[PDB]
Amino acid sequence: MHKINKWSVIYNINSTVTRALRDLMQGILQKI
């Protein structure tokens, strides 16, 4: 369990939910 997955916080979270999360991340970055 010592090898951590990339983006482990959303490992197993489905694409619909991660897409909404990406939408929010990009909204923060685009405001810079």
């Binding site: 990009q26 909204g27 685009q30 405001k31």
Partner: protein, 70 residues
């Protein structure tokens, strides 16, 4: 849309229109170079190319104005 269909629109929804003013200047600068080169004469192939480029730039300025108008 109610809340930005595109990344560019989010960029432009920012308080100080720093991005919009900057983009407008770059488009205007490119359109002026384009008109200067057309004025010098250009071969026919380059002329059709430059005209399409000028219209694309004029279209960009027109869309930018509509996206940022209060």
């Amino acid at each position: 849309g109610s809340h930005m269909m595109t990344a560019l629109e989010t960029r432009l929804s920012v308080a100080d229109g720093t991005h919009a003013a900057a983009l407008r200047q770059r488009l205007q600068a490119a359109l002026a170079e384009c008109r200067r080169e057309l004025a010098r004469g250009a071969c026919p192939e380059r002329f059709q190319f430059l005209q399409q480029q000028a219209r694309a730039l004029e279209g960009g300025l027109g869309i930018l104005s509509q996206l940022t108008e209060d």
